[PDB]
């Protein structure tokens, strides 16, 4: 449950460190969570691939708000993080230091499921 204009930490190796949400896509409501794609602005980057002041797409991977499952259980993280994506829908890096959850078992996240180190499933 992240409202618009929230700050996120980048967990890929593309070079970006800090981003801010500036928009949503479709009709998600007043807040977004894990598995949704948003529009972000880069605030702090140290690299050649990306620079501060650019606008990119990203996917939410971790959040501190409870994530509910059909069986009645839920889990929480201790940080909010995202992964930058290209216009074709592929990550801008090749190594993700994050814990992948059940949301990414879906077919559309095959690339993320390959470059991630630790997986909960």
């Amino acid at each position: 449950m992240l409202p618009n204009y929230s700050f996120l930490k980048v967990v890929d190796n593309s070079g970006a460190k800090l981003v801010k949400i500036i928009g949503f896509y479709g009709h998600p409501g007043k807040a977004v969570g894990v598995g949704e794609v948003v529009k972000v602005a880069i605030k702090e980057a140290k690299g050649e691939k990306v620079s501060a002041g650019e606008m990119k797409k990203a996917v939410i991977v971790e959040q501190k708000f409870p994530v509910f499952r059909p069986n009645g259980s839920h889990f929480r993280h201790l940080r909010n993080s995202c992964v930058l994506l290209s216009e074709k829908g592929q990550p801008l890096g090749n190594k993700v230091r994050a814990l992948l959850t059940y949301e990414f078992i879906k077919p559309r996240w095959s690339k993320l499921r390959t470059i991630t180190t630790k997986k909960l499933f």
């Binding site: 896509y25 479709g26 059909p70 009645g72 216009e87 074709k88 829908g89 879906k106 077919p107």
Partner: protein, 306 residues
């Protein structure tokens, strides 16, 4: 209330006898019909009777797929046919059902008189259900039990909601209010404007204002019947039911279901004939996969790549 009574006058002697003869002729009725309890075919336009139940509370269970299901428990103490209506006397056909039990010295003589006259217990609540044909009438005294319903169907529930007292616009109608700071003065939770100026010059009817909230009749449609316990007269329904514990709830076959669905269920008609004691506890089976979205793309995704 009622309007003041209208004046009455004696009839002239040349007309009084004629009026009385005609009024008596219209008020003369034939013998009461005697319904017979027998299975009947179900037709495209044929409504069944409902039942009167008591709300017990909420619980939860896990289904065959391991999913948590919230449930509301309804208890049917004793529901019986306590009267009939027919065209000759009332102009339409209906069945009257009563439920509950009260002591004789706690009700008015008018209420107790009807039940004593037919050798029936004094019942706390009474409600009417309209039928389509005279053959749909049930004999007086027939019991309506939990076996009246088929597990897995959809039902409608009606009742009175929980009383909340005198409440403001923010809680009663969800008004936004006014800012907590920036110079606001004693108007944080007030409704604000209620009209304009000289035109139109008045406040419209049903304008939303503070008042009492919480004791009103509400209906929920399309709830699922999860489990049935004919022996103990229990119904387990998924979802929320209006009213607090002990509220009186009316249960009916949902109008959202089509004729084909009713035929497939093979609902009892006019009602279940037999002894419900020797019946097992049944749970509905759902031929659906709640985890299909993890194998196939069926979910909502607004972005088109490339």
């Amino acid at each position: 209330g009622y309007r003041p009574a209208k004046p009455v006058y004696p009839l002239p002697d040349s007309i009084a006898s004629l009026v009385e003869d005609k009024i008596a002729e219209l008020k003369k009725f034939g013998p009461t019909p005697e319904p017979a309890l027998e299975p009947l075919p179900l037709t495209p336009d044929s409504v069944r009777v409902g039942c009167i139940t008591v709300k017990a509370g909420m619980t939860h269970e896990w289904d065959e797929h391991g999913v948590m299901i919230p449930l509301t428990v309804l208890w049917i103490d004793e529901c019986q046919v306590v009267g009939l209506k027919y065209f000759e006397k009332n102009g339409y056909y209906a069945v009257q059902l009563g439920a509950g039990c009260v002591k004789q010295h706690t009700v008015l003589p008018q209420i107790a008189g009807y039940y004593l006259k037919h050798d029936l217990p004094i019942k706390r609540e009474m409600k009417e259900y309209q039928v389509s044909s005279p053959e749909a009438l049930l004999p007086v005294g027939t019991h309506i039990t939990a076996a009246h319903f088929v597990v897995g169907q959809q039902v409608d529930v009606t009742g009175y909601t929980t009383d909340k007292g005198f409440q403001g616009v923010m809680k009663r109608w969800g008004f936004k209010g006014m800012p907590a700071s920036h110079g606001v003065s004693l108007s944080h939770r007030k409704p604000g404007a209620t009209g304009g100026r000289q035109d139109p010059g008045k406040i419209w009817k049903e304008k939303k204002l503070p008042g009492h909230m919480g004791d009103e009749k509400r209906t929920q449609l399309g709830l699922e019947l999860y489990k049935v316990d004919p022996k103990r007269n229990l119904l387990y329904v998924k979802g929320a039911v209006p009213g607090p514990r002990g509220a009186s709830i009316l249960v009916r076959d949902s109008n959202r279901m089509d004729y084909e669905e009713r035929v497939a269920l093979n609902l009892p008609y006019p009602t279940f004939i037999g002894s419900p004691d020797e019946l097992p506890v049944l749970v509905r089976k759902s031929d659906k996969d709640p985890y299909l979205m993890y194998k196939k793309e069926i979910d909502y995704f607004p972005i088109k790549w490339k």
